[model samples]
Target: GRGSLKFPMPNYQVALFENEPAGTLILQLHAHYTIEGEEERVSYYMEGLFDERSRGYFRIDSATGAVSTDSVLDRETKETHVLRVKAVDYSTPPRSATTYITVLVKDTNDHSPVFEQSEYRERVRENLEVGYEVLTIRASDRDSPINANLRYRVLGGAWDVFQLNESSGVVSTRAVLDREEAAEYQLLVEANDQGRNPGPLSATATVYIEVEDENDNYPQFSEQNYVVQVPEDVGLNTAVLRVQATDRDQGQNAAIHYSILSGNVAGQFYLHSLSGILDVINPLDFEDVQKYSLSIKAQDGGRPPLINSSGVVSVQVLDVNDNEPIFVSSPFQATVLENVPLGYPVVHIQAVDADSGENARLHYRLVDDFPFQIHNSSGWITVCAELDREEVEHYSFGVEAVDHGSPPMSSSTSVSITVLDV
Candidate 1:
């Protein structure tokens, strides 16, 4: 009886690095079978030597019992290989033996770190506290544990404002954020693995941080002081002037409301809440109030604790020609010596007007022709022609006071003068 084929070792184990070139030798298997005066040659067959995808992953030499790679190996795809091998000899009623071969694929730094998303978008409130977490970015590497150690960081932005936690991949604020100063940020975030054999591999992703606006700024006026001159006789509901203010906030936070905080006790002026246009709602009288100082307040329609500011508007009411010149001293009665002297002063009278500027300026004139003439500016009566007791014993006429206004207004009073013989 011939003995069966026997292998020196029934279980074989080996290790090979991933990405090894094809045809790289793994190991050799030898088997022994002894029969008296008989020749025996062994052949090898390995199970799963060919992957079903029309490709060979590993091969075995029949006569030599040696194994090698048919294609480049990847540890990431398959880490271990367990194969059953058979050895047969050419003999009548052939003998055969089987062995188990375990192949352990070693690791290689072959995969780069990959970000979950190409870009990350986040929103944060303006003036947020420092060290507040804004967002967390994540990345993964397909390498082994030693090569998959990842660290995160940010660049190409305000480094002092935004910082990254290297181990946790969390991005936090390092300083207060202001949307008015900078509305958004474009951060170039990076994730790198500590694969030292071939240097570390890194990936970059864009992080867009949008800072929402807060109602922090106060409403500012275009002018601190406004002065407007309006005629006293201006019609009611007449627009006097406009006040403009602006708030440096977004949306409803920037809405401004206007009001007259003071100097409008009589309800004489109305201010548009949204337009800031000031209009006269009542009759204006220069004699009553010549000037008005209005304190205007502009408040923004933000949340609670709204911001507001005040400004001063000086409204000057100009005089209009409304009142006629009225002679306060009227019915002049005085006597002048006959043939005393030409251009002799006889009497003086005065008048008053209820207006200002040129409208109130008064002048005197005689309504009828007479020897006695009144000075235009001084309102003094003087003899312009010869006066005698026999020719004109008593002079009686009317003197009028006229104002220097458009369509000049005047009022007259009687004047009587008796000439005394010298």
Candidate 2:
């Protein structure tokens, strides 16, 4: 016998990364034999055998003794492989030699970074200062080393407003914002992976930032000067004026209330907080006060409330035709001689109107104007015709006085005539 067969490698050591190509070659075996006499003519055929659990995962070529993979490799499931390379001789009763080998599996960048939430939302006030942290975002990558070194960046051309840390996924404000100008912002953030010594792969997520309201703007009124009116006898609680204001903010911040800043000495007026409806609170008397000057104040609510006092509303109480005229004398009795001459001024009496202006202007006249007539402009009573003693023994007449008001109001006085026999 020459000698037994020999394999240069005691056992094959294969180091493969997970998810490597399915049919990749793993090892090249050098198989040689030397024999003498009958053994020297023997030839050898080689075959690789894995454990029954992993038999079909690898193979060995009988022609070249080269080892190759049969399927895709997943390192997560198995880290190493124990293989046996068997060589058999071409004889009636075959003799065989066996060599063991091991294969070690390594990790790879097969999976990309994943975000816990696909989209996020945050709320902030418009008064946020520069470098104010809006939110903190994070990502997870299964790959290790440089692959898991996730770099963060704000995408979608909005990096100017929202700054992202390259090392950390914290999003901060780059500048202040106004909710009146812009209420919301949509941000896209990219998470990058330094995969496989090359550049990187990325994943993106959206963040919706909602800008809330604050007490920044004061209430504004459209009027430079506002005035309204009510009658002197207008009932209490009657709406006299309205001083509405506009607040541009929202929610509890935009709510408004009303109050009197000045000029309301008698507390004659009150305002509704919501509708700004000014109503009468006290009895209004034109004789007491013809007009009321009021200054209204507006206030808004929030963390810090806003106030303004630029509203002026004048309430004028218009006088009504309430009083009637009164005569200086009533029931006039004077003796006039019989056969009195015509155009004789008899009983020059005047009346006064209690109300002022046109309501005070008196117009005098007689009820019949038969024996005597009164001039409207002068309020003078004069005899129209000669009086006869026997024809009309006693002449009784009434003097009427009227005022030029909206609805003309009049008063009356009686005059008794005692015609003397001359």
Candidate 3:
């Protein structure tokens, strides 16, 4: 009997909720290794004891073998805890036995759902098809399986332009988007869990969508018709008019080029391709051309270029006084009877002008005194006084032709008269 030894066979498991306050009772142990009289001297102690190990989480009473938590427990960090307990009898040489205790930490909904990214960004064209996925958002939770399950949603009122999948977290376009109307959009996306005991927890993330440009508008002219006048004597390369146009598209699609589609002949006119300014490059002659009609075209810089031809330009050439009076004939001769009656018609003279308006009106007069007089506008020679052959056998004088132009021009011609005896 002195050489015999026995060991306790008490190995048990227990379950406790996580996040329990310190000093919470777990179980009471009864070790049965024994001498009947040594029951009063039996003691219990935990094995491998240290403040840095599991020993710090549980403590057992040396006399009663009662197990209790020393500190709070988190199921997310550790779901199970194991400890070894020893019982010894009071004798000259003590006898001892060891038992294994398993503590199962139950789960609790203590963690909130969190998004993987704080913010997300996406770029899409304005012409992108509807129901196209723009992005997929994701989130995670540190709680138990049932509490970690998350659902996604978009915050705020119902949006017709975009759709968010509640279960998949996929964001898609729900309606047509125009870059000219709205270039950007900001959305708030949320993730919620289904935990019940303490209510659900949620988190949010920001989503930014940038819309790109597309060419869908045509070039529009500012006016339907443009009319301007250019003086014939004006210097060459003068700007006559400026035609303007606009396009609603962006970038190169909005850039416009101006040109003359028709009515430009003899290389008399030029147009600025980018500036839309029309200039007369050649001399303008009112006698040759009175007015010019030009068809204008505006084209955009997009591929296959959209064009507009809703405008026309008119250039009117104004007249200028540049021509001088010219006599049709010179050295006129007229014969009249001596002692003719007054106001008697003799001979008529004529002059011509190549100019227009007031510049072409001609006036005729005798330059020197003679036996005859000439009409101012008719150029008709008449006898204003009596003519005699004895006083003067032959009479000679000068006739002048003038125009009504500013700084008037004149030409002279000689007329000879011979008097016959009555």
Name the top TM-score candidate: 1
Q: Write the per-residue lDDT of candidate 1 for residues 1-422, one digit (tens) a residue.
A: 25868778888889898889999898888877755325666788887544543225888888888899988888988888777789987778888888887889887778888999889989889888889999999999999877789988775666767889889999898888899888788889888888775678888999999999888988888887888998889999999988998887787778888888899989889999988999999999998899999998888777753655568899899888888888776767889887678899998878899888778898888877467777899989888877667667887888888878877878889888888967
Clashing pairs in 3: 339-387
Q: Give the C-alpha miss distance for residue 78 in model 2, angstroms.
A: 4.4
Cα deviation at 12, candidate 3, in Å, is 4.8
For model 1, the run of ten residues with the poorest summed lDDT: 47-56
Q: How far is candidate 2 from the true structure (C-alpha RMSD, Å)?
A: 5.2
Best by lDDT: 1
- C-alpha TM-score for every candidate: 0.89, 0.75, 0.75
Q: Find the number of clashing residue pairs for candidate 2.
A: 1
Model 1 regions more than 4 Å off: 1-8, 32-40, 49-56, 92-97
The per-prediction CA RMSD against the true structure, in angstroms, equals 3.1, 5.2, 5.1
lDDT string for model 2 (44-85, tens) is 343335457665777776766677778888765677877777
> How many backbone overlaps does candidate 3 show?
1
Q: Report lDDT (Cα) of residue 373, candidate 1.
A: 73
